[PDB]
Amino acid sequence: KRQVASGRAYIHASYNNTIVTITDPDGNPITWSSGGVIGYKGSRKGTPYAAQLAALDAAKKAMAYGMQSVDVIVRGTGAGREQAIRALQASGLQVKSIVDDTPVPHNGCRPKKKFRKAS
Amino acid sequence: PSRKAKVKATLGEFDLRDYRNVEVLKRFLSETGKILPRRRTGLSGKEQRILAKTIKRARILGLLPFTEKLVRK
Amino acid sequence: PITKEEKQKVIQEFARFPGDTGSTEVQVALLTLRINRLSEHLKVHKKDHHSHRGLLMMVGQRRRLLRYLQREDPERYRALIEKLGIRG
Amino acid sequence: MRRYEVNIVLNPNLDQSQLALEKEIIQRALENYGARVEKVEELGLRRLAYPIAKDPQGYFLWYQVEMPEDRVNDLARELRIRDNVRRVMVVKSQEPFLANA
RNA sequence: GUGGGAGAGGGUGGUGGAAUUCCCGGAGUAGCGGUGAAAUGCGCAGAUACCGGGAGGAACGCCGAUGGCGAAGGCAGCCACCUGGUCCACCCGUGACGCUGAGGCGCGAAAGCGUGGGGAGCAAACCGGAUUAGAUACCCGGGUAGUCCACGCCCUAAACGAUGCGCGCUAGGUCUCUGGGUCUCCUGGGGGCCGAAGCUAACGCGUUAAGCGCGCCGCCUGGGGAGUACGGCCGCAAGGC
RNA sequence: CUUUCU
Ligand SMILES: [Mg+2]
Ligand SMILES: [Mg+2]
Ligand SMILES: [Mg+2]
Ligand SMILES: [Mg+2]
Ligand SMILES: [Mg+2]
Ligand SMILES: [Mg+2]
Ligand SMILES: [Mg+2]
Ligand SMILES: [Mg+2]
Ligand SMILES: [Mg+2]
Ligand SMILES: [Mg+2]
Ligand SMILES: [Mg+2]
Ligand SMILES: [Mg+2]
Ligand SMILES: [Mg+2]
Ligand SMILES: [Mg+2]
C-alpha cells in the first residue's frame, strides 16, 4: 500500500545478473526484482532474457503500488542492460526518460587482479 | 573523426586564463563535466593546456561540474 | 628569490668598473649569493635532493672560477675572498 | 609583495546584517595580513555546478589584493575559519592569455 | 649581464570532487555473489538494489598525446610558498677561466629492514571453494606482512636506447613540442618518422649516427663450473661490492 | 574452463 504513480526505475546491470529496483520520487525503493528473483540461479541470471522477466516483474509489482510513469536510470554493463530497458519501455509503465548514471572513479581504489592491467 | 564543429570557431576573443567565465568555459565541456579533446576544443597545445588548468579552478569554485549524468540512451 | 634590483646591487658592489658584469669577481660574488640562499633553502627541505645538485653545481663552478683567479692575479684573489667571506 | 586574486564563497542564506558581518571579518583579515585591496567584485548568487555544503547555491566575492607572498597561505587559513565561509581560493595575478582574438 | 619563454623537475603546507569500505537513519524483500559450470561466502540479527547523513584511507578520471620536465631512479587533481635545471633575443661584460675523470662524496624503481604512526581498497604467506590423474597453480571466497606516512637503513634491476661524456665535420624530406624574426617561410632548442654519402655479419644506424675524426673514463677476451668458493670492505638483517 | 607424455 502507498499508491505513487510516478517514480524511479533503477537498472543495475552486470555480467553476472541484473537487479531492477522501482522507487518513489524520493528514491525510497517501492519494489525490486533480480534475475534470480525468478528462479534462474547461476548463469542464466545474466542472460538478457532474465533481465526482461526481471524488468517486467518489478514493473508489475510496481503498478501494484499504482505506478504509471517512471524515470529510468541505468548503472552497469551487462548482457541485459539495454534489454531491461527494452522491457520497462514496454510493460505498461511510462518511461519518461533514460540515463546512464554508472559510477566511475576519478582513479582511486586499486581494483582486483581480475580487473587490473589497466594503465 | 568528429568534424561536427569546433568550440573555438563558434566563439570569440576570450581570456583562456579566466577561471570564472562560466559561460564561455561551459562551452569546452561535454555532455558531462568532461573536458573536450582537441578534435573538439579546436584549441592548440599551449591553449588546450591552459584551458584545462583554468577549467579545473572553476570546477573547484563550484562554477563547473566535474561530471554530469547522461540524458537519453 | 633574488630580485632584479637586489641582484644588480651585488653586481655593482663587485664589478671591476662601470658596466663590468661577467668579470670573475662579479661572477664569484654573484654565485656566492645564490649558493647561500640555496644553502638556506636546504637548512630546511633536507629532503629536497633535486635542488641539492644545483647547489653542487654552483659550488663547482665557483670553486673553479676562483681556482683560475688565484692562478691569475693572486691578489684580486686574497681580496675577493676575505671580502666575499670564503675559505676556512 | 605581489598581486593575487581572492575568490571567496560564503553561505547564500545570509541576512544583510549577517552578511555585512562576514565582509567585515574578511576586511579585517585581509588588512591584518597586509592584503592591500586593489578592487572588489560583488557577483552575488549563482547556480553552483554541484551542491556545496548541502546548499545548492553560493554567494561569491572577489578581492584582487597586493600582499606579501610570505603571508598568503596564513591569510588563507584565517579567511577559511569563518563558518559561513564555504570556499576560498587565492590565485596569483596573471596577465590575461588571449585567444581567438 | 639584461630582457623574453615552456615544463607532471624537487621540497613544505594546505586543499577539491569522483569511487570503494565501514557506521547511522529512511524505504524495501529474498536473495545476493561468483563461474566454463559451480561451491565456498555473505543475507530474515533483513543482505543485494535505492535514497540521506557521517567517518576514514589511498589514488587523482576527462584534459592526456605519436606530448612535457629531470642527470638517472623518476615526475602528472587544484593552491600558495620555498627551490633546481633549461631554451631564446641583444651581443653588453670576463678573457681559455676548457673536456674527461681512477678514488671520494651524493642520488638511486621495486621488494626488503628498524622505531613510531596509519590501514579504505589491494594482497605474498596463509585459511577455504573449485578444477585436476595429482594442483602445494591457474579460477572463486576470505586474508596477515606489505602497500601508506615520518625518521633511519638497504643499493638492486630487462636501473634499457640492452647504444659513456664532450667537440668538430658529413643531402634532404616529413610530423611534432617550445622561443625569436621582415610569421603560407626563415631561424634556435627538444621529441619522432623516411632517407644522401657512409657504416654494418646481418638486422639495422643515418645532423637525436651505430658515419668521418680528436680527447678522457668504464669494460670484454669460448661454454659449463659460478656471480659460486675463499679473502676483504659494507649491512641490523636479507644481503651487497 | 582445465586437458600431461610419445
Ligand atoms: Mg662584446
Ligand atoms: Mg679586453
Ligand atoms: Mg632504493
Ligand atoms: Mg618501498
Ligand atoms: Mg617497515
Ligand atoms: Mg586454493
Ligand atoms: Mg584471492
Ligand atoms: Mg580481497
Ligand atoms: Mg628532422
Ligand atoms: Mg630537430
Ligand atoms: Mg646507401
Ligand atoms: Mg633510418
Ligand atoms: Mg671458463
Ligand atoms: Mg661486521
XYZ file of C-alpha atoms (C1' of nucleotides) and ligand atoms in Angstrom:
642
model
C 0.000 0.000 0.000
C 1.111 3.527 -0.934
C -0.029 4.416 -4.460
C 2.646 6.512 -6.129
C 2.039 6.870 -9.884
C 5.479 8.125 -10.910
C 8.962 7.418 -9.556
C 12.388 5.924 -10.302
C 13.446 2.740 -12.087
C 16.964 1.706 -11.227
C 18.537 -0.865 -13.532
C 21.694 -2.352 -12.049
C 23.267 -4.288 -14.937
C 26.301 -6.581 -14.738
C 27.855 -9.560 -16.479
C 26.535 -11.628 -13.589
C 22.949 -10.542 -13.053
C 20.536 -7.623 -13.236
C 18.545 -6.347 -10.335
C 15.899 -3.724 -11.036
C 14.596 -1.506 -8.300
C 11.497 0.652 -8.745
C 11.171 3.554 -6.306
C 9.266 6.713 -5.373
C 10.292 10.299 -6.364
C 12.244 10.357 -3.113
C 14.295 7.313 -4.022
C 12.913 5.095 -1.251
C 12.541 1.753 -3.072
C 8.974 0.595 -3.690
C 9.665 -2.776 -5.310
C 12.627 -4.673 -6.694
C 13.483 -7.870 -8.511
C 16.648 -9.579 -9.652
C 17.019 -12.302 -12.221
C 17.395 -14.944 -9.605
C 14.297 -13.291 -8.190
C 12.750 -15.523 -10.821
C 14.342 -18.930 -10.315
C 17.362 -18.703 -12.637
C 20.047 -19.499 -10.090
C 23.529 -19.412 -11.576
C 24.486 -18.332 -15.019
C 21.068 -17.805 -16.615
C 20.638 -14.962 -14.125
C 22.760 -12.981 -16.573
C 21.055 -13.796 -19.862
C 19.405 -10.739 -21.405
C 16.109 -12.640 -21.237
C 16.431 -12.850 -17.472
C 16.696 -9.080 -17.377
C 13.468 -8.967 -19.360
C 11.489 -11.038 -16.872
C 13.024 -9.013 -14.083
C 12.217 -5.615 -15.526
C 8.675 -6.759 -16.275
C 8.219 -8.293 -12.821
C 9.417 -5.229 -10.926
C 7.263 -3.247 -13.356
C 4.183 -5.301 -12.434
C 4.734 -5.216 -8.686
C 5.332 -1.520 -9.284
C 1.991 -0.857 -10.938
C 0.524 -2.746 -7.974
C 1.569 0.244 -5.858
C -0.399 2.082 -8.512
C 2.633 3.140 -10.599
C 2.313 4.544 -14.126
C 5.272 6.724 -15.238
C 8.963 6.324 -14.412
C 12.397 7.905 -14.878
C 14.830 5.150 -15.815
C 18.362 5.120 -14.520
C 20.990 2.640 -15.557
C 24.230 1.603 -13.975
C 26.413 -1.130 -15.318
C 27.351 -3.063 -18.397
C 25.678 -6.418 -18.801
C 24.117 -8.756 -21.317
C 20.845 -7.275 -20.159
C 21.289 -3.575 -19.569
C 19.842 -2.037 -22.711
C 17.458 -5.006 -22.656
C 15.941 -4.467 -19.218
C 15.184 -1.042 -20.630
C 13.534 -2.574 -23.694
C 11.353 -4.253 -21.086
C 10.365 -1.258 -18.917
C 9.687 0.801 -22.021
C 7.058 -1.772 -22.975
C 5.476 -3.356 -19.894
C 2.753 -0.891 -19.017
C 4.792 1.891 -17.493
C 5.553 5.249 -18.999
C 9.318 5.603 -19.226
C 9.612 9.371 -19.180
C 13.417 9.252 -19.582
C 16.630 7.254 -19.507
C 20.033 7.999 -18.049
C 23.318 6.228 -17.662
C 24.487 7.078 -14.178
C 27.067 4.329 -13.813
C 29.666 5.241 -11.174
C 33.263 5.628 -12.358
C 36.145 6.720 -10.090
C 38.431 9.599 -10.933
C 41.012 6.894 -10.149
C 41.099 5.825 -6.546
C 40.910 2.237 -5.318
C 43.222 -0.390 -6.740
C 40.936 -2.893 -8.459
C 41.227 -6.666 -8.052
C 43.791 -8.512 -10.176
C 40.725 -9.647 -12.042
C 40.342 -6.036 -13.251
C 43.919 -4.701 -13.232
C 46.362 -4.412 -16.142
C 44.533 -1.133 -16.659
C 47.016 1.753 -17.082
C 36.555 11.509 -36.720
C 34.176 14.096 -35.233
C 34.043 17.023 -37.666
C 30.734 18.361 -36.328
C 32.027 21.826 -35.351
C 34.764 23.431 -33.228
C 34.428 25.251 -29.905
C 36.943 27.917 -30.878
C 35.107 28.660 -34.136
C 31.726 29.216 -32.518
C 33.252 31.714 -30.087
C 35.159 34.994 -29.902
C 38.188 36.578 -28.277
C 38.311 35.305 -24.697
C 40.856 35.039 -21.917
C 41.689 31.338 -21.647
C 43.025 32.267 -18.227
C 39.630 33.406 -16.917
C 38.603 30.930 -14.237
C 35.129 32.439 -13.933
C 33.806 32.937 -17.465
C 31.416 30.143 -16.545
C 29.595 30.973 -19.737
C 32.499 30.547 -22.141
C 34.022 27.605 -20.290
C 30.844 25.517 -20.216
C 31.411 25.547 -23.982
C 34.534 23.407 -23.719
C 32.913 20.744 -21.560
C 30.963 17.821 -22.989
C 27.661 16.201 -22.054
C 29.477 15.615 -18.764
C 31.919 17.737 -16.781
C 34.476 16.047 -19.044
C 36.858 18.439 -20.763
C 36.826 18.281 -24.534
C 39.741 16.884 -26.585
C 41.367 18.981 -29.247
C 39.356 17.481 -32.137
C 36.541 19.278 -30.352
C 38.041 22.108 -28.318
C 39.695 23.143 -31.554
C 42.332 24.679 -29.279
C 46.080 24.115 -29.530
C 48.892 22.676 -27.465
C 49.604 25.783 -25.421
C 45.954 26.846 -25.391
C 44.213 23.498 -24.738
C 46.716 23.263 -21.928
C 45.737 26.480 -20.192
C 42.101 25.743 -20.829
C 42.418 22.515 -18.872
C 44.037 24.093 -15.844
C 41.651 27.060 -15.916
C 38.643 24.762 -16.064
C 39.819 22.841 -13.051
C 39.745 26.056 -10.990
C 36.204 26.911 -11.993
C 35.227 23.383 -11.088
C 36.654 23.939 -7.638
C 34.826 27.236 -7.149
C 31.684 25.243 -7.791
C 31.353 27.065 -11.083
C 31.661 23.982 -13.306
C 30.786 20.297 -12.939
C 33.376 17.584 -12.614
C 30.940 15.147 -14.141
C 27.362 15.273 -15.457
C 24.800 12.481 -15.829
C 23.888 11.284 -19.326
C 20.392 12.170 -20.582
C 18.661 9.856 -23.103
C 20.223 6.478 -24.011
C 64.210 34.788 -4.578
C 66.873 37.234 -5.666
C 65.049 40.248 -7.086
C 66.469 42.039 -10.116
C 67.284 45.173 -8.113
C 68.536 43.153 -5.159
C 70.758 41.269 -7.585
C 72.205 44.164 -9.607
C 73.124 45.742 -6.290
C 75.630 42.928 -5.855
C 76.831 43.277 -9.430
C 77.749 46.865 -8.741
C 79.140 46.029 -5.324
C 81.772 43.870 -7.055
C 82.171 44.987 -10.665
C 85.733 45.979 -11.653
C 84.414 49.117 -13.380
C 81.162 50.661 -14.736
C 79.421 48.049 -16.874
C 81.508 45.149 -15.599
C 79.227 42.161 -15.248
C 80.864 38.902 -16.333
C 84.099 39.673 -14.505
C 85.393 36.804 -12.375
C 84.822 38.830 -9.205
C 81.323 39.883 -10.156
C 80.683 36.292 -11.103
C 82.080 34.707 -7.956
C 80.426 37.432 -5.918
C 77.180 36.529 -7.717
C 77.274 32.738 -7.232
C 78.242 33.218 -3.611
C 74.871 34.909 -3.420
C 72.731 32.151 -4.909
C 74.730 29.489 -3.130
C 73.963 30.943 0.272
C 70.253 31.344 -0.387
C 70.040 27.737 -1.559
C 72.257 26.751 1.338
C 69.395 28.127 3.433
C 66.624 26.511 1.448
C 68.237 23.239 2.454
C 68.725 24.041 6.130
C 65.131 23.002 5.680
C 63.850 20.652 2.985
C 66.803 18.408 3.766
C 64.602 16.100 1.708
C 64.915 18.177 -1.486
C 67.708 16.419 -3.331
C 66.935 17.641 -6.814
C 67.830 21.167 -5.792
C 70.843 19.997 -3.850
C 72.523 19.012 -7.114
C 72.097 22.553 -8.379
C 73.932 23.604 -5.249
C 76.647 21.104 -6.016
C 76.972 22.580 -9.466
C 77.142 26.196 -8.368
C 79.860 25.369 -5.911
C 81.702 23.509 -8.598
C 81.564 26.433 -10.966
C 82.584 28.768 -8.161
C 85.394 26.783 -6.605
C 86.505 26.753 -10.216
C 86.409 30.462 -11.159
C 88.361 31.113 -8.005
C 90.919 28.481 -8.911
C 91.541 30.472 -12.058
C 91.587 33.726 -10.149
C 94.309 32.684 -7.742
C 96.174 31.238 -10.728
C 95.934 34.603 -12.468
C 96.076 37.617 -10.175
C 96.790 36.020 -6.768
C 95.984 39.460 -5.344
C 92.438 40.027 -6.546
C 92.029 36.568 -5.062
C 93.045 37.267 -1.465
C 90.851 40.347 -1.771
C 87.672 38.848 -3.231
C 87.681 36.001 -0.725
C 88.294 37.897 2.515
C 85.706 40.306 1.167
C 83.103 37.796 -0.030
C 83.622 35.644 3.051
C 85.052 32.292 1.904
C 87.867 29.813 2.604
C 88.174 28.369 6.104
C 54.680 41.979 -2.214
C 52.870 40.511 -5.229
C 49.348 40.658 -6.674
C 46.784 37.898 -6.026
C 43.076 37.250 -6.560
C 40.963 36.214 -3.581
C 37.893 34.239 -4.550
C 35.604 33.685 -1.594
C 32.267 31.926 -1.441
C 30.011 32.174 1.603
C 26.602 30.944 2.666
C 23.933 32.375 0.319
C 21.314 32.374 3.072
C 22.950 35.284 4.845
C 20.912 38.213 6.110
C 22.186 41.621 5.063
C 23.272 42.004 8.694
C 24.756 38.527 8.989
C 26.350 39.051 5.587
C 27.681 42.509 6.344
C 29.225 40.788 9.358
C 31.265 38.470 7.130
C 32.533 41.074 4.678
C 33.710 42.826 7.827
C 35.766 39.987 9.303
C 37.152 39.459 5.799
C 38.244 43.107 5.540
C 39.966 42.825 8.907
C 41.741 39.605 7.929
C 42.893 40.969 4.590
C 44.154 44.025 6.428
C 45.771 42.183 9.337
C 47.904 40.307 6.802
C 48.909 43.179 4.539
C 46.244 42.441 1.967
C 46.195 45.801 0.248
C 42.817 45.738 -1.542
C 43.046 46.798 -5.202
C 39.401 46.227 -6.124
C 36.378 44.064 -5.401
C 33.504 42.424 -7.233
C 30.125 41.508 -5.759
C 28.824 38.848 -8.127
C 26.254 37.678 -5.595
C 24.433 34.387 -6.016
C 24.958 31.862 -8.805
C 23.938 28.303 -9.681
C 26.738 26.028 -8.491
C 27.514 23.055 -10.732
C 27.162 20.911 -7.626
C 25.825 21.463 -4.085
C 28.351 22.933 -1.666
C 27.795 22.133 1.981
C 24.374 20.676 1.132
C 23.420 24.125 -0.198
C 22.636 24.260 -3.978
C 23.684 27.924 -4.327
C 26.522 30.237 -3.369
C 27.428 33.848 -2.628
C 30.619 34.898 -4.401
C 33.113 37.650 -3.663
C 36.430 38.645 -5.257
C 39.127 40.874 -3.848
C 42.209 41.462 -6.007
C 44.909 42.231 -3.446
C 48.626 43.049 -3.255
C 50.059 41.491 -0.093
C 53.364 39.813 0.909
C 53.752 36.329 -0.597
C 55.229 35.165 2.713
C 51.755 35.533 4.272
C 49.174 34.464 1.682
C 48.978 30.902 2.982
C 48.382 32.114 6.566
C 45.946 34.741 5.324
C 44.115 31.919 3.554
C 43.840 29.973 6.805
C 42.351 32.968 8.596
C 39.844 33.566 5.810
C 38.653 29.981 5.889
C 37.926 29.876 9.637
C 34.557 31.622 9.254
C 31.773 29.001 9.250
C 29.571 30.838 6.768
C 32.620 30.810 4.502
C 32.138 27.937 2.082
C 35.257 28.257 -0.136
C 38.335 30.454 -0.509
C 40.894 30.428 -3.351
C 43.808 32.792 -3.944
C 45.237 32.611 -7.471
C 48.343 34.711 -8.224
C 47.545 37.531 -10.611
C 48.170 36.631 -14.262
C 48.397 38.716 -17.453
C 45.292 37.513 -19.342
C 46.163 34.972 -22.021
C 44.030 35.975 -25.012
C 42.892 33.518 -27.678
C 40.832 33.523 -30.849
C 41.368 37.283 -30.625
C 74.824 40.619 -17.710
C 69.857 42.481 -19.491
C 65.256 41.034 -21.335
C 61.527 37.218 -23.017
C 59.541 31.608 -22.576
C 57.581 26.460 -21.905
C 57.669 22.339 -18.268
C 53.884 16.031 -14.266
C 61.954 18.884 -12.112
C 62.156 18.941 -6.447
C 60.693 20.291 -1.065
C 56.582 22.132 2.708
C 51.855 23.399 3.771
C 47.134 23.484 2.553
C 43.010 21.927 -0.157
C 38.572 19.695 -4.367
C 35.386 16.313 -6.267
C 34.558 11.004 -8.062
C 34.629 5.996 -6.257
C 35.400 1.812 -2.541
C 34.886 0.148 2.642
C 32.650 0.927 7.210
C 28.892 3.305 10.768
C 23.903 5.798 11.173
C 18.830 6.819 9.535
C 14.951 6.031 5.514
C 12.329 2.866 2.199
C 12.349 -2.196 0.653
C 12.343 -8.319 0.459
C 14.793 -12.862 -0.660
C 18.202 -13.325 -2.409
C 22.997 -11.608 -3.405
C 27.680 -13.021 -5.217
C 30.731 -15.533 -8.134
C 31.960 -19.311 -12.756
C 33.338 -22.603 -18.146
C 29.836 -24.890 -14.639
C 29.965 -24.272 -9.612
C 30.922 -24.094 -4.482
C 32.827 -21.674 -0.660
C 30.984 -16.886 1.184
C 27.552 -13.240 2.751
C 21.515 -12.412 3.776
C 15.016 -12.982 7.826
C 20.060 -10.248 13.943
C 16.835 -8.253 6.926
C 21.622 -8.859 2.833
C 21.658 -7.326 -2.526
C 19.392 -2.906 -5.291
C 17.841 2.620 -3.922
C 17.880 7.450 -1.004
C 20.108 10.664 3.055
C 23.944 11.587 6.572
C 28.889 10.621 8.694
C 33.731 8.708 9.198
C 38.454 7.075 7.058
C 42.298 5.624 3.949
C 44.574 5.672 -0.648
C 44.603 7.308 -5.814
C 43.744 11.638 -8.683
C 39.207 10.425 -14.312
C 38.367 13.879 -18.632
C 42.334 17.237 -20.220
C 46.278 13.209 -21.911
C 49.215 12.695 -26.668
C 52.770 9.503 -31.802
C 53.065 15.333 -25.523
C 56.284 17.846 -21.494
C 60.198 18.072 -17.425
C 64.654 15.689 -14.914
C 71.450 13.509 -14.655
C 69.458 8.839 -13.590
C 65.928 6.308 -10.485
C 61.575 9.052 -11.932
C 57.615 13.095 -12.015
C 51.003 14.284 -13.665
C 43.601 16.964 -9.042
C 43.960 22.270 -7.557
C 46.549 26.483 -4.345
C 50.411 29.181 -2.196
C 55.311 29.216 -0.563
C 60.307 27.644 -0.997
C 63.891 25.822 -4.835
C 66.955 23.190 -9.133
C 67.632 22.799 -14.370
C 66.845 24.888 -19.275
C 65.615 27.412 -24.463
C 65.618 32.167 -26.918
C 66.854 37.625 -28.336
C 70.605 41.532 -27.678
C 75.537 40.808 -28.298
C 76.692 44.271 -23.427
C 80.760 42.017 -19.591
C 85.212 38.209 -18.169
C 89.237 36.694 -21.469
C 90.858 29.774 -22.493
C 88.572 30.542 -16.828
C 88.191 24.324 -21.210
C 86.973 18.487 -21.675
C 87.244 13.748 -19.218
C 87.500 11.912 -14.828
C 90.795 6.301 -11.125
C 89.315 7.278 -5.774
C 85.987 10.166 -2.731
C 81.149 12.154 -1.791
C 75.846 12.448 -3.161
C 71.330 10.469 -5.515
C 69.316 5.883 -6.705
C 62.214 1.807 -9.124
C 60.514 -2.269 -6.514
C 60.907 -5.733 -2.800
C 63.091 -5.697 1.879
C 64.849 -3.973 7.295
C 64.456 -0.687 12.158
C 61.270 2.708 15.520
C 56.704 5.030 15.603
C 52.014 6.097 13.259
C 48.253 4.676 9.738
C 45.177 0.854 7.325
C 39.789 2.279 2.802
C 40.942 -0.806 -1.388
C 44.618 -4.448 -2.823
C 47.238 -8.652 -1.357
C 52.938 -12.687 -0.716
C 52.267 -16.129 3.217
C 48.072 -18.386 4.866
C 42.884 -20.398 5.543
C 38.882 -22.236 2.416
C 35.872 -23.489 -2.557
C 36.561 -25.424 -7.461
C 39.269 -27.793 -11.433
C 42.705 -31.983 -11.995
C 45.040 -38.309 -12.732
C 47.612 -35.155 -8.670
C 47.063 -28.949 -8.277
C 51.355 -27.448 -2.623
C 48.757 -23.482 -9.574
C 45.985 -21.245 -12.904
C 39.744 -19.776 -11.307
C 36.302 -18.317 -6.839
C 35.722 -16.854 -1.358
C 38.377 -14.785 2.839
C 43.205 -12.846 4.338
C 48.363 -11.257 7.619
C 53.157 -8.708 6.320
C 53.083 -5.217 2.985
C 51.337 -1.495 0.093
C 50.508 4.438 3.079
C 53.350 8.476 6.403
C 57.730 10.018 9.288
C 62.733 9.362 10.645
C 66.759 5.777 9.969
C 68.850 1.541 6.725
C 69.243 -1.354 2.273
C 71.586 -0.029 -3.323
C 69.479 -3.925 -6.558
C 67.089 -4.186 -11.763
C 65.378 -6.106 -18.946
C 68.446 0.734 -13.348
C 67.407 -0.149 -21.494
C 68.149 3.445 -26.479
C 70.324 -3.695 -23.814
C 73.871 2.436 -27.539
C 79.799 6.527 -21.642
C 80.793 12.025 -21.873
C 82.488 16.392 -24.764
C 83.689 18.838 -29.534
C 84.179 19.401 -34.973
C 82.751 17.587 -39.674
C 79.166 14.945 -43.477
C 71.993 15.670 -48.776
C 67.281 16.376 -47.882
C 62.255 15.264 -46.915
C 58.146 14.945 -43.065
C 55.209 15.414 -38.294
C 55.514 17.449 -33.618
C 56.667 20.416 -28.540
C 58.923 25.435 -27.109
C 61.349 30.700 -28.233
C 62.652 34.523 -31.991
C 62.073 37.008 -36.736
C 60.764 41.013 -42.073
C 55.360 34.681 -39.357
C 51.659 30.022 -46.036
C 58.759 30.948 -44.626
C 63.472 31.706 -42.394
C 65.983 30.759 -37.676
C 67.363 28.227 -32.427
C 66.327 24.454 -28.631
C 63.836 19.348 -27.875
C 60.935 14.912 -29.434
C 59.548 11.239 -33.851
C 59.450 9.081 -38.726
C 61.663 8.222 -44.098
C 66.054 8.643 -46.089
C 72.385 11.299 -49.136
C 77.142 9.681 -48.513
C 78.902 6.390 -45.373
C 78.971 2.289 -41.702
C 77.057 -2.907 -40.520
C 77.774 -10.190 -40.173
C 73.172 -9.104 -40.980
C 69.061 -6.638 -38.761
C 69.660 -2.070 -38.944
C 72.007 3.010 -37.826
C 71.992 7.563 -40.852
C 72.960 16.003 -38.209
C 68.884 12.751 -31.907
C 74.943 8.094 -36.195
C 75.610 2.711 -34.976
C 79.082 7.801 -40.479
C 84.097 10.800 -40.557
C 87.571 12.311 -36.619
C 90.317 14.016 -31.538
C 90.277 13.782 -26.140
C 89.239 11.377 -21.343
C 86.704 7.261 -18.373
C 84.436 2.083 -17.878
C 84.515 -2.566 -19.744
C 85.184 -7.567 -22.989
C 88.960 -11.870 -24.173
C 84.958 -19.665 -25.798
C 80.805 -22.590 -22.905
C 79.724 -25.107 -18.211
C 81.597 -24.934 -13.092
C 79.800 -19.822 -10.840
C 78.391 -14.214 -9.828
C 79.743 -19.932 -6.778
C 84.123 -20.693 -3.199
C 87.846 -18.050 -0.240
C 89.565 -13.427 1.482
C 88.373 -8.243 2.249
C 85.027 -3.954 2.734
C 79.826 -2.526 3.568
C 74.994 -4.114 6.164
C 70.565 -4.668 11.810
C 69.352 -8.450 8.614
C 68.323 -10.131 3.979
C 72.112 -9.490 1.548
C 75.703 -6.077 -1.466
C 80.535 -4.931 -3.794
C 37.371 -23.888 -18.287
C 41.404 -27.331 -17.305
C 43.383 -31.201 -20.764
C 50.161 -34.440 -19.420
C 53.684 -37.737 -22.211
C 55.438 -40.080 -27.080
Mg 81.337 42.235 -26.823
Mg 89.557 43.238 -23.211
Mg 66.160 2.474 -3.105
Mg 59.436 0.706 -0.931
Mg 58.592 -1.164 7.607
Mg 43.073 -22.821 -3.318
Mg 42.363 -14.491 -3.930
Mg 40.096 -9.472 -1.154
Mg 64.376 16.028 -38.717
Mg 65.457 18.748 -34.598
Mg 73.176 3.926 -49.221
Mg 66.697 5.323 -40.932
Mg 85.956 -20.823 -18.261
Mg 80.676 -6.620 10.620
